[PDB]
Amino acid sequence: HRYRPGTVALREIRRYQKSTELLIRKLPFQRLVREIAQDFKTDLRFQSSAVMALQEACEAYLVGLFEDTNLCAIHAKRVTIMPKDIQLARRIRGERA
Amino acid sequence: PHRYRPGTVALREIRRYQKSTELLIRKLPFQRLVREIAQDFKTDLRFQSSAVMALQEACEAYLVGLFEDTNLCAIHAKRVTIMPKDIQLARRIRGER
Amino acid sequence: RSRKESYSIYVYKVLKQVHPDTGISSKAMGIMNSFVNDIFERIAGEASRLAHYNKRSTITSREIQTAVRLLLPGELAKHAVSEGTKAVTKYTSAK
Amino acid sequence: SRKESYSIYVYKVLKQVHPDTGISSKAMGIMNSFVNDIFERIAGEASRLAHYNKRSTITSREIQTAVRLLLPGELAKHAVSEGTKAVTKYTSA
Amino acid sequence: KVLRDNIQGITKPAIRRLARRGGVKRISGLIYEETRGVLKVFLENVIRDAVTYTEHAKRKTVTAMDVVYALKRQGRTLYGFGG
Amino acid sequence: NIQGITKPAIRRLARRGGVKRISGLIYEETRGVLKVFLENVIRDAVTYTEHAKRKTVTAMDVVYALKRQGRTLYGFGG
Amino acid sequence: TRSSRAGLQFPVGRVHRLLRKGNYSERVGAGAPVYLAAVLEYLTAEILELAGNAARDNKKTRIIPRHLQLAIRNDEELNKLLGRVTIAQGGVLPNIQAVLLPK
DNA sequence: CCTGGATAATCAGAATCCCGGTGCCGAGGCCGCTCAATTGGTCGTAGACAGCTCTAGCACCGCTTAAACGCACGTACGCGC
DNA sequence: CGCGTACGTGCGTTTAAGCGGTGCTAGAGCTGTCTACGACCAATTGAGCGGCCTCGGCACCGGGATTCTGATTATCCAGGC
């Protein structure tokens, strides 16, 4: 049959909140890290655990930002998150000026 | 007679208290509150007047910034009146417990 | 071959003291070592700040005590104060 | 009892940048607290990197990279140029 | 003399003035209590640090420097009172 | 590169954060926020490495950069 | 040693060496490394305690970083201590807001 | 007799529990070197502590009047649809 | 788009914020002398970490087999016209 829009999302929430595996793949994020690092210094090498540390910290920061974004979206009488929620979360957080 | 519409005196007070720099909380009730709170932590304590002034400056600045984030959250909640849930969401995004 | 130091066997001994039939992974062991190092750096820097503020060049047990009472939350700080004072008195008794 | 402060130096800098402009006592206290706060921040950053690089001294390079880490881009760049010209004209003279 | 209910010394027009300085146009009636509690959440977070400084200096008088160092610890540093 | 952070990857990151419904511009805003955060942390780590006189950015510089930014990470030699 | 003299397991030697070499003060007292090792020992005892409890709750004999994340975020004071601390391979707590639940 | 809602079944897929392999491993404990902890002993000065002095925090007391409470009225704002 | 009303506004009343003239003493601050605990150096020693080897969890793949709702059609019953 057919499922309602939003139940597979809740199942994915219950699945990924119990797991610890990284949700961004290693090679495109590693290429993005290297592309950003070439903008600051040329001829750089990267340890693999450095890229793993960057991936873990960035994924945890984005998960916490999505938590605050969902809180802002719920407070804004919605269930769908929006870039205004991200902007308000980064404004109260002090990252965005 | 004469009676202003609701919303003009609040804006005039916003402009007046944003133009000025003097402390909005009175000195003696705040000093009594500080002595009461510090009396609940350690009995027989004296207080420099400049210490209570520094406490008043820091508390007033923190409450003004909290009211700024509260007004921003109330605007994001499609309102113009601030609510205690705005204070609560601003303190949750700020990381205060 | 460089001889890198760590807190592996020490945290292993404390784990065996609190849970005899429980092990620990190296991914958790690195987190525990970083936790011990972070708490060490925080309490030592807080003692350094207190010694610099109180115009004293000596970091005694009192400086670490007020560093723990500043950094740790109330029940945790109280239990750490009791543990620290107990170990300081037991070190003072022996020679 | 002598209380050391950066009062006359900030007075000299202010008269260098604004000769018809004085400072108040509260603003002088704010400036003196700012100087000590920035000094403590840069010195703590240089001490942190000196502890990181296994080195028991703090030279001009550690203060330079502490300024480059702490201060934002244009401010850090201008402070880097000012620090390097001061180190060079201290070394020559 | 005993000290009781000084938290209500922070009157509703004071919280109104703090909201006007913060840019708040309309204030609910349930704000003036709750913000006061947040002020307690401020003050019990600050002075409890500063007394911990005052207990280390073996003093019975809370100075401005202990308040400044308590604000230094909380990430809420202040200019104009030393440091 | 920056589009290498795919829409299902940001979808999984939102599912871990507890987001039920995701807008279309959420992926691009998350890409921009991730780019800014990676720019800051990688800039601090590159400053650490160029002060350490090395051409290989280690995990120690990443750990110290995250400790600088108030986002201290446990598990990589802290 | 000095760990056996103090009833502790953590080394007084390593802590007393790092307190001197860490550029913390001119002189470092003798009661300070015992106190710091005891505080570190109680803190790792509480963390390993709640980690072992979480490992027994998850039916595992070895402590994984998920158990450490459960031990940190489940306790209020341990989460308050490690508030700005990211644990690698730790994840988040299972938490779904009320409006996200279906009717 | 018509009609609206509550429930009490209904099978039906989507998801979930369970077993089997090729797979590479990674905890955790012993062998053993080795350099940092231990220990004895000497130099020294930060600081403990009792003295002195001295600003400044606290208490009171009362003139003045700006500041706050509360009531009454009402319109425009929160929220319900 | 509309409904109900909460908080904006002004004035009378009442309350205590502020002023700046006064006494006191408690505790911050300056000082002065002696010392024990802390650094420094040298020989000694043993706990610590490198190496490596065995084993206990380890894994997400895959196609039958369990199970848990969900859309699904229908069906019954009590209330109102």
Crossing angle (nearest 10°) for helices E64-73 and B49-76: 30
Bridge-based pairing state of the strands F21-22 and B46-47? unpaired
CA angle G58-G59-G61, nearest 5°? 110
DSSP helix/strand/coil, E79: coil
Find the closest chain F residue to D63 by CA distance: F51
Mark the breaks in chain F: residue after which each occurs, C to N over 2.5 Å: none
- Residue burial F7-20, b: 16+ Cβ < 10 Å; e: rest: eebbbbbbbbbbbb
Say whether the CB atom of G47 is under 7 angstroms from strand H. Answer: no
DSSP helix/strand/coil, G83: coil
Are the CB atoms for B41 and E45 separated by under 8 Å?
A: no
Would you say how long chain A is, in residues? 97
Does G63 contact chain F (CB < 8 Å)?
A: no
In Å, the largest CA–CA distance within chain G is 66
Reported CATH class of domain C1-95:
mainly alpha
Residue C11 burial (10 A CB sphere; 0-12, 13-18, 19+): buried
Say whether the CB atom of E9 is under 7 angstroms from strand H. Answer: no
Per CATH, is E4-83 categorized as 1.10.20.10?
A: yes
G100: containing domain: 1-103
**Closest in A77, A84, A89 to B93, CB measured:** A89
Experimental technique behind these coordinates: cryo-EM
Are the CB atoms for D43 and F25 separated by under 8 Å?
A: no
Are the CB atoms for B84 and E31 separated by under 8 Å?
A: yes
Q: Point out the nucleotide closest to B32 (alpha carbon to C1′).
A: I17
Would you say how long chain G is, in residues? 103
* Adjacent-strand bridge partners of G69: none
Question: Could F74 and C37 be called an inter-chain contact, meaning their C-beta atoms sit closer than 8 Å?
Answer: no
| Count of other CB atoms within 10 angstroms of residue G80 | 14
Structural Rg of chain G based on CA atoms: 19
Q: Which H or E run includes F30?
A: helix F26-51
Strand H contacts in C 15-54 (CB under 7 A)? 23-27, 51
Distance CA F56, CA F58 (A): 6
In Å, the largest CA–CA distance within chain A is 55
**Closest in C10, C23, C39 to G43, CB measured:** C39
Residues 6 or more apart whose Cβ sits within 8 Å of residue G26: C57, C58
Q: Right CATH number for D1-93 from 2.40.50.100, 2.60.260.20, 1.10.20.10, 3.40.50.300?
A: 1.10.20.10
Question: Could F25 and A83 be called an inter-chain contact, meaning their C-beta atoms sit closer than 8 Å?
Answer: yes
Say whether the CB atom of G84 is under 7 angstroms from strand H. Answer: no
* Adjacent-strand bridge partners of G85: F72
* F:3-22 residues touching chain G, CB 8 A cutoff: 16-18, 20
Q: Is the dihedral of CA C40, C46, C50, C51 positive or negative?
A: positive
How is residue C58 annotated by DSSP? Answer: E
Number of continuous H segments (helices) and E segments (strands) in chain A: 4, 2
Distance CA G13, CA G4 (A): 12
CATH code of the domain in which G41 resides: 1.10.20.10
Q: Is it the case that chain B and chain D have 3 or more CB pairs lying under 8 Å apart?
A: no
* Adjacent-strand bridge partners of A81: F22
Question: Could F18 and G96 be called an inter-chain contact, meaning their C-beta atoms sit closer than 8 Å?
Answer: yes
Residues in chain D with CB shorter than 8 Å from the CB of E79 are: 29-30, 33-34, 37
Q: What ranges do the domains of chain C cover?
A: 1-95
Q: Right CATH number for F1-78 from 1.10.1660.10, 3.40.630.30, 3.40.50.620, 1.10.20.10?
A: 1.10.20.10
Residues in chain E with CB shorter than 8 Å from the CB of C49 are: 69
Residues in chain D with CB shorter than 8 Å from the CB of E80 are: 26, 29-30, 33
Q: Is it the case that chain A and chain B have 3 or more CB pairs lying under 8 Å apart?
A: yes
Q: Which H or E run includes G14?
A: helix G12-21
**Closest in G42, G48, G80 to C83, CB measured:** G42
Chain I positions with a protein C-beta closer than 7 Å: 6-11, 16-18, 26-30, 37-39, 47-51, 56-58, 70-72
A69: containing domain: 1-97
Find the closest chain D residue to G22 by CA distance: D51
- Which pair of structure tokens corresponds to residue G87? 């644990």
E22-E27-E31-E35 Cα dihedral, nearest 10 degrees: 10
- When divided into structural domains, chain A yields a total of 1
Size of the A and G interface in Cβ pairs below 8 Å: 43
Q: Which amino acid is at F46?
A: V
Residue B90 burial (10 A CB sphere; 0-12, 13-18, 19+): buried
Q: Is the dihedral of CA G7, G10, G13, G16 positive or negative?
A: negative
| Count of other CB atoms within 10 angstroms of residue G62 | 11
Q: How would you classify residue D7: left for phi > 0, otherwise alpha for psi between -120 and 50, otherwise beta? A: alpha
Chain H positions with a protein C-beta closer than 7 Å: 12-16, 26-28, 35-39, 46-48, 56-60, 67-69, 74-79
Distance CA E54, CA E63 (A): 8
How far are the Cα atoms of B4, B11 from residue B1, in angstroms, in the given order? 10, 22
CATH code of the domain in which B78 resides: 1.10.20.10
Q: What ranges do the domains of chain E cover?
A: 4-83
Question: Could C31 and G65 be called an inter-chain contact, meaning their C-beta atoms sit closer than 8 Å?
Answer: yes
Residue keyed to tokens 């502890």: D51
Are the CB atoms for B56 and E17 separated by under 8 Å?
A: no
Are the CB atoms for G32 and C68 separated by under 8 Å?
A: no
Does B82 contact chain A (CB < 8 Å)?
A: no
| Count of other CB atoms within 10 angstroms of residue E82 | 17
Crossing angle (nearest 10°) for helices A48-75 and B84-94: 180
Nearest alpha-carbon partner for G47 in E35, B12, C79, D51: C79
